[PDB]
Symmetry: D3
Subunit: 291 residues, 6 copies
């Protein structure tokens, strides 16, 4: 029962994703295409990375992640197809996903195929990989790929072959690690006792604010649940609350919750109210937290 | 061929829905996950209710409706899983859905799993239920649920177990009726001969205006198709049109149509033009109807 | 493994599409419903046409395209169901879609079912058709169709019967060609040496500008890749670039690329930057091009 | 104590009006410059006309109205300077302005100087004129006028000479009536008993809606204060109220007032609430009124 | 050399203010009309109050303040004309305005004429009054006032008579104190050691945030310059800065300054950046201060 | 008859300017205060400079320009008061302003008083100065100036003393040239034959685009009226038109006019249509021009 989980910047306002899906069903008749999302900021490889990094543990083993923003479409660039190593635990706590104790996933159980443009940076960081290949075989990509639609040609199409059981090592030549493009992930710096990062994302549609300050950055600073925090956003907007597991811990609706999100990072929200929207808080604003 | 029809407030801009779906396929490999919608106003249980109440008759019997906005995520709250009684006719007329005379649906043929937060108020109102259980079993929910992600932990996960044939009564303790949280559904009042309600929704993306004045409410006044109505929105807009079956009955494009929507409610629109958008009409504005 | 590819104006903000899908799975238990998109401008038949015309070559043979904007919902109008002739090559170059040399699609391999309101004009233009029928049989549509929901009653539902193998010729009487409503496709005019058309679409979410000036119109002017072009939008913006295969050919990020999009049309973008959005360029603006 | 009352489209965001004023004080040291307004929609001669037509009765005799939108600036066009005849009563009732019984103004007591572009159409209609001259004398305009600033050169400057006592007949040659450009003022038509006009203006900053239906159009239709009116706006938005002298007559705050504005025209408003803004009502929308 | 300082809600987008001014010059030929502002929120008497309360010390003795938002226009209501008592010091410090030690203003040296709608509440509070009269005499108001234009009829006109030396006591009957309408000025409450008020205004066009926590309120807590304050806006923004005299005291551009504004009120801003606009801070949001 | 022409960033939404005016009339009873404008972008000294540099030739000799954006308000900074040298011709052509051959202005005839923050940079550049003084004397500024209102304390107030005939040299110590803060005026660069500058301003309310490319820069390139120009905005919009004196020279309404504005600068507009607004063109965008 092959799955392709499909994350793109293609949007859902035209038939672009459907073209890809048509081809996925063409190539892998029995496939299930799962949309991850298609609304990532176009060409923002770091943002795209966020939508795909945590996926493996939730998916059945053998799932192929077709993940693409492809601003280098139509160039001599070729996608990378990698088998990841650890499906990797996640969340505020770091666990296997699912009922009971969760579902453990065997190593080497997921393939990502993406533009070799750094999209997979954090996937590779968090999961490691067992093998990586340049996607060049005309068995898995068009001989004449549409210049402006490498998302389809060099990701959707070959992901469907991979889902169909096309041997990964046959999509093209092995890539050495240095040949896998990566983006530099900005460090959470320590400025005194304070951890200084950025708003990594606004958690739509809630307006929760996610920072790139991980629980590990917090552990590394001696802050666990219950710790009274000052979280300053945008070097202007100050917030103060204990670190709590969840939103309702803030008490009243609208109260500030500082918490660890489901991806494991320091975040801030109002309890059942949007924090980000009324204040127009945005991804990329500084996030400083201090006890 | 089990189906989970999934309605959440999770949006489609990140991988949150995909995480739930990954887990649904993990748990119930042969499941078809049908998106209901994921764009509901977060935490607005009355709005969420509107997207799920009409669903059963459309779906094959045995469908599980995983329906969730979960502001109380991470609290001691637990979801409720209910087997509804009547699949219930619907529409302007009140009929089975489908070709011919429609597909009659057996009773007790659908399960809803939702936060016990009132989301299912109108589902229970319109369909009744045969049994309801608190969702507590570690067989169907994580032993260590992600605090901020009960949509996944307490709805998506257990829904897939239910879709996989996990016995409903084994999800947890039977809930007594009074233990099923309900929201108060504001009544359509009679102010003289006029029926007084609200705009229940703007019917996106058309900008049609839906009221909570149901066909049955109109029948209480003997208002049927052909009746020349004054529909006053926001207190000051005495729209006038006969009640007609459809938009084109208004005649010229842009003409006011007063009609019964597909959910059976008194609605107002322009014929092949947006009524609500140009004039910024909104849910919650008063609506009054009379002949 | 039947597929219904479903393109509507229903949006994805409520359960409307899900109701259609529920019925599609009810009627055709084995079906895979692939969303094309549901965000088309309501009632804009010409725009809806763009999202469906290029679909066939992407999909497995036997796919049914349920394509609908239905402003005449509730009227005596009835859908048209057509078996197209040529799946037809497409793209900047004009080729079969897929890996290798692409997937050749047999003739007569796809059915569209749509309102008979011109939605299928370009489908018919580009693919031809072998047979067209009015969709009237209560075997494939409701006896009492919901007045305001013909998208479901007269498209979704019968599309699922067609997917389920209901004989096309049994949906109703054959339509003669003149009975299939067409919209007039505005011609690309020659104004001297310049080809004059319109911005056909803003390519969301990138803000690329698509014109209705086809590759064929360009190679009729001796315009091929490498030609230095002046492309004037909205009658005042005389962008200049060579015609290149792709965005990155513009060089620096933000530079103007004039290219043939994946649908084969003269288009203009910035390289990995939005062209349309900063300047609020829009569909329907004039588009002039000269070598 | 000479007054120039100055109405332009120059805005108040830069020093444009100040340049004009500087010159007015240069030429007429003892002048008082009164700003009428400078925010009229640029080049909208009909809208500009509204801001100047009612002015004379409020001003001391001898006031010069410098009134300008000048889209033909820098052309061979020359301003017209006219001495009006009747200062003319105004208002909902038609009276002299001021305390007691008002201040009667002698005939021939005001000069307008404006581009000869129709700006003065309604001034001439409502007031008549005694003499009109083309403004060409280098005694009153620059020998080398700034091409893009005829508002200054051909209106502000010569208005200051006129205020200073420069003989009007000496600014240039007499204009025959046909040489005074006029705009066609759209008629309030009778469609049955209903009077059909347009929203002439949104009365900022209140959001009151003014129509071009005059009390005389209403008198001519048998509607005076107390008459129950239906006023339909934009051929969509319907309103109903008696014709009342004022806003507070509507009763509750927010209630619909249909009234005659201070310029004498049928208008509609909410009582101490904005009508136009929440509904995005605009100038140019149809205004149909019926009893 | 009489001055009328004119504050209305009339806006500057049409000729309404000019009509009033024309009449002011008609009645008092030698008057200087000073615009205070005309952009106040219509009908918001508390906001209007803020624009007029601080005016007297700035103006030459004998200045008439014509101050008006007149929602009760056209009713039996009549304006009030008051001679204030103390011109009153002001500012962060509480001082006479002007160079050197400032211009001391005699008592009883200013008249306000306003609707008797509470607009003068804070004027009377902060300045006291010596006499107050209802404005009823046809010597100073129209015998037939334009119903919808009492700003002109009952304020502008009589103000000019007052400016011309019309005896104040002759405008009409003396009003007893209780006959002068007042609005309730919400108190700055003490919630522990914190002072709890509201954002009284956004200081346009800078986006500074003004509170109704006056210097005198801070003095009640012994809060002076240098005190490290927590200023919480909207309930969740614990701004922290010392109370400083000015913006630049915050140091770097964009740093938070907590200060006493020129009206003497606790305020918060960024240094040479907008505080309110980026975060959409608004009048009426809660404000709390403590050391 | 002294004049103070007052340009500030104070806006016109509150009584701030009126307070300044009150004091100006207090200090200089005979003065006429002419508003230049009060809407300049706060703290933008370069933009403020544009509104004041061209003023002198328009005003009667002896005019005082009180020009202020004062982000250093409340600091030890003190205003500069300068007597300029040349009133200087201006416009597209470079001429005295006024009727006939214009009004020649004697040298040393105008005083500017401003924060010493570079606001006067272009004033000094274009007019030169004869004398400059630091404004420190308590005869012309408050002994205890309001910390946050130096616009009033250090500009308005002393400007009125200067208007009143207070000797300029007595306001404080002479400033040496190096003590008068200047901003760096970005140069118009030559990039080949093309002149490269910036959009200096959007000319509101018309949406004309002004560049910092001066007539002098054009006639140094042999560019005069009639020259066919390519003017590229924002690095992507290569508008083409001949250089013409005025907007109407573009022909049809909406056509592109490239012209020299009234300040003498290369500008681009549409003929009686907004260029800047539809395309959201902005100050600071690159502006390139070539013959
Ligand atoms: N203007 C664009 N520049 C660079 N890449 C673009 C642009 N528009 C779309 N794309 C990319 O094309 C990929 C299809 F293969 C899409 O997913 C975009 O990332
Ligand atoms: N800020 C929030 N406050 C309360 N609940 C929230 C917030 N943000 C998201 N949620 C809920 O978390 C659920 C996942 F379990 C989402 O569906 C939200 O309803
Ligand atoms: N206001 C409307 N006028 C005409 N058609 C409409 C309107 N709103 C929705 N529709 C059509 O109803 C169809 C379902 F049958 C939707 O797909 C809309 O096209
Ligand atoms: N783009 C423009 N086209 C035509 N007229 C314009 C344009 N911009 C400004 N103006 C007119 O110039 C007059 C100055 F004399 C202004 O008052 C505008 O009406
Ligand atoms: N819609 C309105 N309701 C009540 N008062 C209003 C309305 N529009 C304007 N006004 C008042 O009329 C006054 C002139 F006398 C204006 O200053 C408004 O306050
Ligand atoms: N937030 C502010 N930072 C620095 N200066 C400011 C701020 N708000 C207002 N100002 C200046 O105060 C001056 C009056 F003296 C105003 O003109 C602003 O320039
Ligand atoms: C915190 S609510 C759960 C969904 C959310 N978008 C997340 O990924 O964590
Ligand atoms: C308005 S046509 C059908 C779709 C609509 N949202 C409905 O539920 O009735
Ligand atoms: C612009 S890159 C590919 C997606 C685009 N919407 C297309 O149809 O070609
Ligand atoms: C109706 S309130 C008075 C001012 C308004 N703008 C008018 O001209 O009538
Ligand atoms: C903010 S600087 C001075 C102007 C301000 N609006 C005030 O009244 O204090
Ligand atoms: C654009 S026409 C005249 C007004 C313009 N703001 C200028 O300074 O030239």
């Amino acid at each position: 029962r092959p799955i392709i989980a499909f994350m793109s910047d293609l949007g859902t306002t035209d038939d672009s994703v459907a073209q890809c899906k048509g081809l996925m069903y063409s190539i892998c008749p029995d496939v299930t295409v799962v949309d991850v999302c298609h609304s990532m900021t176009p060409w923002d490889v770091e943002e795209g990375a966020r939508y795909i990094v945590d996926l493996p543990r939730f998916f059945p083993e053998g799932t192929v992640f077709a993940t693409t923003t492809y601003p280098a479409t139509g160039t001599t660039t070729r996608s990378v197809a990698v088998r990841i190593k650890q499906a990797a635990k996640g969340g505020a706590r770091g666990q296997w996903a699912g009922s009971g104790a969760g579902f453990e996933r065997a190593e080497g159980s997921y393939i990502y195929i993406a533009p070799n443009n750094g999209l997979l940076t954090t996937v590779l960081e968090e999961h490691g990989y067992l093998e990586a290949y340049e996607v060049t075989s005309p068995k898995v990509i068009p001989e004449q790929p549409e210049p402006t639609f490498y998302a389809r040609e060099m990701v959707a199409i070959p992901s469907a072959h991979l889902a169909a059981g096309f041997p990964l090592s046959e999509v093209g030549r092995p890539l050495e690690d240095h040949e896998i493009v990566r983006f530099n992930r900005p460090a959470v710096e320590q400025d005194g006792e304070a951890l200084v990062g950025v708003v990594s994302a606004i958690d739509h549609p809630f307006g929760n604010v996610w920072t790139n300050i991980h629980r590990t950055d917090l552990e590394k600073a001696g802050i666990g649940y219950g710790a009274r925090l000052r979280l300053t956003l945008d070097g202007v907007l100050p917030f103060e609350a204990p670190l709590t597991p969840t939103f309702a811990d803030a008490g009243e609706i609208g109260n500030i919750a500082i918490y660890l999100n489901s991806r494991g990072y320091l975040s801030i929200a109002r309890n059942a109210a949007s924090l980000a929207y009324p204040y127009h808080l945005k991804e990329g604003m500084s996030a400083r937290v201090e006890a």
